[PDB]
């Protein structure tokens, strides 16, 4: 269930290198379910790793280009 804010979430996670649901919630001022669905979309796209046993993920993709 795809979201218009996906690209903005990917800019945040690849700039910040944080991909927790709480970090995305705080940045975009959105709810848990909506943030969680975008992070699962990022995992399908190879932007972030699967979650570890504690739900933490690592950001794989590079930050946005500056030119």
Domains and CATH numbers, the chain: 1-60 (1.10.10.10)
| Phi–psi pair at 31, nearest 5 degrees | -80, 170
Give the C-alpha separation, 35 to 33, whole Å. Answer: 6
Show Cβ contacts of residue 57 under 8 Å, excluding neighbours closer than 6 positions.
19, 20, 39, 43, 48, 49, 50, 51
End-to-end, the C-alpha distance of the chain in Å comes to: 31
Resolution in A: 1.4
Method: X-ray
Cross-strand pairs, 48: 59
Of residues 57, 67, 20, the one with CA closest to residue 9: 20
Cα angle value 64/52/5 (rounded, 5°): 35
């Amino acid at each position: 269930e795809d979201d218009p804010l996906y690209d903005e979430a990917v800019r945040f996670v690849t700039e910040s290198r944080r991909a927790s649901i709480s970090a995305v919630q705080r940045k975009l001022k959105i709810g848990y379910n909506r943030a969680a669905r975008m992070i699962e979309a990022m995992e399908m796209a190879g932007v972030v790793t699967p979650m570890n046993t504690n739900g933490s993920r690592e950001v794989i993709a590079p930050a946005p280009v500056r030119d």
